[PDB]
Amino acid sequence: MRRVAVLGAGPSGLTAARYLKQAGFEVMVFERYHHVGGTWNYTDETWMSEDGRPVYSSMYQNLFVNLPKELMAFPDFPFHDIEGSYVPSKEVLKYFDNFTDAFDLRKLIKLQHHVENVRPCESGWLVTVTDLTTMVEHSFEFDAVVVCTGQTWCPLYPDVEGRSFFRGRLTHAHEFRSPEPFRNKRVLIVGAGPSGHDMALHISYVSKEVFLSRKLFPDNVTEKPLLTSLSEYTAHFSDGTSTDVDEILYCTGYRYRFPFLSPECGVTVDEKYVYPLYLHMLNINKPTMLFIGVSYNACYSIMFDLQAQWVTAVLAGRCTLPDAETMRKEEAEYMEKQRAEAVHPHVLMNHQWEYFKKLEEMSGAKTMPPVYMKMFDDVASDLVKDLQNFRKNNYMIIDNENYKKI
Amino acid sequence: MRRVAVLGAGPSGLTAARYLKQAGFEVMVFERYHHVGGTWNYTDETWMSEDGRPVYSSMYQNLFVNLPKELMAFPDFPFHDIEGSYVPSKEVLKYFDNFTDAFDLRKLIKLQHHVENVRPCESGWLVTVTDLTTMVEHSFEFDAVVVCTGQTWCPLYPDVEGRSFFRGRLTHAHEFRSPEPFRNKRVLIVGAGPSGHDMALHISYVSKEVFLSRKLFPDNVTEKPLLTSLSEYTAHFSDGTSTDVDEILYCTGYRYRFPFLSPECGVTVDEKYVYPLYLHMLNINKPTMLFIGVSYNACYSIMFDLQAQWVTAVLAGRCTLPDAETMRKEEAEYMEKQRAEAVHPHVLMNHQWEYFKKLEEMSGAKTMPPVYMKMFDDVASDLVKDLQNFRKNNYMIIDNENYKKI
Numbered sequence: 041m042r043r044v045a046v047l048g049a050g051p052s053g054l055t056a057a058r059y060l061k062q063a064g065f066e067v068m069v070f071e072r073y074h075h076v077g078g079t080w081n082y083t084d085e086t087w088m089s090e091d092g093r094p095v096y097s098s099m100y101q102n103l104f105v106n107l108p109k110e111l112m113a114f115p116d117f118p119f120h121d122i123e124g125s126y127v128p129s130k131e132v133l134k135y136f137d138n139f140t141d142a143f144d145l146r147k148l149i150k151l152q153h154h155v156e157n158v159r160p161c162e163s164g165w166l167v168t169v170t171d172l173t174t175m176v177e178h179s180f181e182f183d184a185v186v187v188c189t190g191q192t193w194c195p196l197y198p199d200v201e202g203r204s205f206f207r208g209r210l211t212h213a214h215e216f217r218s219p220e221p222f223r224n225k226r227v228l229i230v231g232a233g234p235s236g237h238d239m240a241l242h243i244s245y246v247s248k249e250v251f252l253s254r255k256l257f258p259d260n261v262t263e264k265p266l267l268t269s270l271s272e273y274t275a276h277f278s279d280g281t282s283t284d285v286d287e288i289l290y291c292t293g294y295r296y297r298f299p300f301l302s303p304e305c306g307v308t309v310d311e312k313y314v315y316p317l318y319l320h321m322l323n324i325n326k327p328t329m330l331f332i333g334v335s336y337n338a339c340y341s342i343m344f345d346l347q348a349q350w351v352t353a354v355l356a357g358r359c360t361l362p363d364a365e366t367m368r369k370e371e372a373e374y375m376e377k378q379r380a381e382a383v384h385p386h387v388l389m390n391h392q393w394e395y396f397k398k399l400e401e402m403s404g405a406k407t408m409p410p411v412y413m414k415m416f417d418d419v420a421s422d423l424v425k426d427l428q429n430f431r432k433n434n435y436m437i438i439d440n441e442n443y444k445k446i
Numbered sequence: 447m448r449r450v451a452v453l454g455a456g457p458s459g460l461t462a463a464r465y466l467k468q469a470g471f472e473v474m475v476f477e478r479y480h481h482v483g484g485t486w487n488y489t490d491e492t493w494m495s496e497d498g499r500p501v502y503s504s505m506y507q508n509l510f511v512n513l514p515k516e517l518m519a520f521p522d523f524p525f526h527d528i529e530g531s532y533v534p535s536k537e538v539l540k541y542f543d544n545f546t547d548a549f550d551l552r553k554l555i556k557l558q559h560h561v562e563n564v565r566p567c568e569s570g571w572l573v574t575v576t577d578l579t580t581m582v583e584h585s586f587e588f589d590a591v592v593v594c595t596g597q598t599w600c601p602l603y604p605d606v607e608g609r610s611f612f613r614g615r616l617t618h619a620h621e622f623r624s625p626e627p628f629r630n631k632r633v634l635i636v637g638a639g640p641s642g643h644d645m646a647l648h649i650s651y652v653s654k655e656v657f658l659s660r661k662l663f664p665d666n667v668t669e670k671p672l673l674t675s676l677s678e679y680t681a682h683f684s685d686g687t688s689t690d691v692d693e694i695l696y697c698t699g700y701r702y703r704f705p706f707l708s709p710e711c712g713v714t715v716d717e718k719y720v721y722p723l724y725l726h727m728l729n730i731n732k733p734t735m736l737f738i739g740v741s742y743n744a745c746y747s748i749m750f751d752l753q754a755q756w757v758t759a760v761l762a763g764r765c766t767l768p769d770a771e772t773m774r775k776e777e778a779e780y781m782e783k784q785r786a787e788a789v790h791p792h793v794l795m796n797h798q799w800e801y802f803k804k805l806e807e808m809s810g811a812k813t814m815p816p817v818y819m820k821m822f823d824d825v826a827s828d829l830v831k832d833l834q835n836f837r838k839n840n841y842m843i844i845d846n847e848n849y850k851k852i
């Protein structure tokens with residue numbers, strides 16, 4: 041166990057590379073874009089790039105973070121000193137470029153390399169990639185592979201009665217880049233929890249009327265219950281109401297999609313479920329393949345930090361895992377409990393802190409500063425509770441235990 | 447029986463109007479567009495019009511007819527003097543504009559009136575329509591309703607495995623207006639029979655490569671067998687081949703859609719089946735509602751002409767219909783035979799001349815000049831046998847029995 045492939049140089053991939061490199065592995069990171077940082081990169085491009093491969097970023101113009109920069113930074117790599125907690129996206133991109141440079145990761149990253157296929161070979165892995173600058177295909181052999189390609193690029197559209205009758209413009213959150221196409225339009229946003237809050241707000245500034253449909257806002261945003269059918273130009277809702285709309289915008293999230301995974305990798309990828317994974321990371325069938333960033337709805341800084349340290353510990357043999365039968369059993373029990381609590385398989389929100397404590401114990405990682413939990417539990421929901429104003433709040437962490445509002 | 451509603455002022459509607467007027471009925475024709483002629487009207491608009499209602503035209507730029515004008519003219523209303531048998535679409539539009547004036551129909555037609563709802567009331571019908579120039583909703587009462595709203599506007603897309611993963615541009619024939627968005631693109635056209643021939647030809651003139659997939663063409667049109675799956679930017683075919691494409695164009699036809707029909711009208715509308723209809727026209731459940739132009743794949747001039755005369759004859763009490771029981775029996779047997787011949791419910795192609803003869807006998811219509819059958823049987827398929835060149839052929843009807851190529 042020496043040569044490890046990292047697939048993706050977004051936050052997940054970058055974190056993995058730091059820990060794997062520190063642990064003495066020979067790391068190679070493949071990234072299709074020309075810049076690290078994942079979806080924090082903004083591009084005018086959507087769906088497919090002119091370079092011939094998908095656009096993976098769903099970033100849009102003028103986005104600000106929905107969590108204070110103080111909680112988005114890794115505990116041992118603070119954000120650059122810039123005024124304000126709720127920074128524009130470019131500051132987060134800058135953060136990951138610095139992070140990459142700080143840990144001497146850049147030399148490990150093959151930019152504009154699009155991973156096309158991954159398959160088991162002997163006990164290791166064969167990774168096939170295209171160098172998009174030459175269009176030459178390259179194959180590389182590795183002892184382990186860490187999949188960090190994200191899950192905010194392949195859109196999910198929930199089925200709705202009559203959807204195929206609708207004649208207005210239908211788009212997904214993935215391709216949202218600016219509110220301009222929605223100017224003076226009657227817009228229905230189909231959302232889930234907080235998924236459509238920010239886009240509703242952005243669109244409210246240019247559109248005639250916004251309808252936010254889900255199973256606080258500006259005056260021209262009208263909340264609606266569940267969308268129940270569509271007709272040619274009209275939306276019908278669970279309350280028996282209906283409204284005419286020119287545009288429908290699905291803020292209905294994404295599905296897992298890992299096109300490069302050959303069936304022999306032993307991973308089954310369904311819309312909301314990737315299996316069989318232990319702790320959302322380890323491929324139970326082929327345990328030298330691991331994923332970072334499959335789990336979601338959590339304090340991501342800590343999640344990335346810990347999953348990278350856990351993956352690293354497993355590959356270095358410092359973490360001894362239960363046998364496969366036990367891992368399948370624990371996974372099975374975990375997933376039954378997800379269903380009982382009515383959340384999707386890889387959603388961490390209800391138990392993230394306990395999950396992180398487990399990762400800490402198994403990986404040998406430094407314990408997380410409790411202030412992350414206190415601050416997160418206090419402010420994470422502010423988007424849904426004080427959408428128009430929460431980003432004016434500024435915070436400063438005082439010590440390992442406490443923070444304050446400025 | 448005095449007041450008759452005609453829904454639509456395309457060829458079906460106009461033709462109906464002519465005979466209904468002739469028979470002395472009080473006819474009111476509703477047409478959402480500002481010009482008669484139906485699908486023969488070209489508009490840059492697609493899907494939804496800025497006027498707030500659907501766009502029903504699927505006409506594209508630089509279209510020429512696929513059947514000689516001699517077969518497109520009604521037997522008793524010859525085409526205006528124009529050089530060439532295969533005329534541009536605007537000459538067909540001109541033909542129906544002239545027809546409308548020649549028969550003094552224009553006065554009957556409420557243009558820019560969009561039919562919103564039709565429902566039975568007492569013994570007659572209540573028709574709800576919007577005057578799009580005022581956005582005022584108007585109600586009208588009728589003793590009978592003739593539905594002529596067409597069926598080339600509501601697209602049909604066949605499911606294909608992986609369609610949801612495709613990230614290229616996916617469009618339907620309905621929204622095709624010019625080949626320009628396909629310039630320098632790799633284009634897959636998904637077709638059935640002749641459905642994608644003309645569009646393949648149009649696009650071939652501008653694109654890098656055109657692939658025509660179906661269950662003689664220009665050099666850059668490559669025929670492919672059935673499309674079996676899609677991925678991000680690649681199409682996969684039944685022959686085990688794969689091709690990367692930027693664009694998919696669905697030439698997969700349409701489905702029946704009559705949104706204004708309340709369930710009480712007694713008609714069930716499925717994708718390829720409208721029921722219960724006698725001879726593709728009469729609503730067996732509510733026999734004062736009739737349809738013209740539900741049947742298709744036939745010599746359309748004769749079909750419109752005879753169906754209009756038949757509908758008029760029924761409404762005038764001159765056509766003796768079987769009782770409802772017999773009509774249901776004949777419909778069921780007819781539909782059973784359609785399945786056996788492997789054609790969709792309303793496809794006339796295998797038996798149109800016999801069907802036309804039956805309409806003639808029942809309605810008292812003038813017998814069709816046999817030359818229509820002889821010529822149609824000779825030239826209708828020239829589109830698929832000599833696509834690039836068939837439109838250079840010119841014809842002349844000599845008499846009711848003979849024609850010659852010029």
Ligand SMILES: Cc1cc2nc3c(=O)[nH]c(=O)nc-3n(C[C@H](O)[C@H](O)[C@H](O)COP(=O)(O)OP(=O)(O)OC[C@H]3O[C@@H](n4cnc5c(N)ncnc54)[C@H](O)[C@@H]3O)c2cc1C
Pocket residue numbers: 047048049050051052053070071072073076077078079080096098099100104105106107112153154155156188189190191192300332333340341
């Ligand atoms: C619109 C939006 C707003 C958000 N706002 C916030 C916020 O305010 N705060 C917050 O904490 N989180 C936010 N997030 C979530 C945050 O973006 C993710 O948590 C984080 O970026 C996940 O990082 P990742 O490395 O797992 O995935 P990504 O950042 O998506 O990176 C995946 C990487 O893999 C690369 N890649 C993918 N496929 C291939 C391939 N075949 N070959 C080579 N490379 C490949 C991509 O180029 C990309 O660089 C937001 C997400 C979105 C979509």
Ligand SMILES: Cc1cc2nc3c(=O)[nH]c(=O)nc-3n(C[C@H](O)[C@H](O)[C@H](O)COP(=O)(O)OP(=O)(O)OC[C@H]3O[C@@H](n4cnc5c(N)ncnc54)[C@H](O)[C@@H]3O)c2cc1C
Pocket residue numbers: 453454455456457458459476477478479483484485486502504505506509510511512513518559560561562594595596597598706738739746
């Ligand atoms: C791309 C294309 C090429 C074709 N080429 C040929 C050819 O070469 N030769 C040939 O013989 N045939 C051709 N056809 C078929 C031809 O267009 C039809 O056979 C003919 O137009 C059908 O006439 P129709 O009146 O039944 O329907 P349409 O022509 O579609 O007319 C329907 C009318 O109803 C109106 N309408 C619909 N709903 C409403 C509502 N709710 N309220 C008010 N008005 C409404 C529409 O505006 C329209 O004016 C072609 C069709 C297409 C799509």
Ligand SMILES: [Mg+2]
Pocket residue numbers: 806807810811812813
């Ligand atoms: Mg006769």
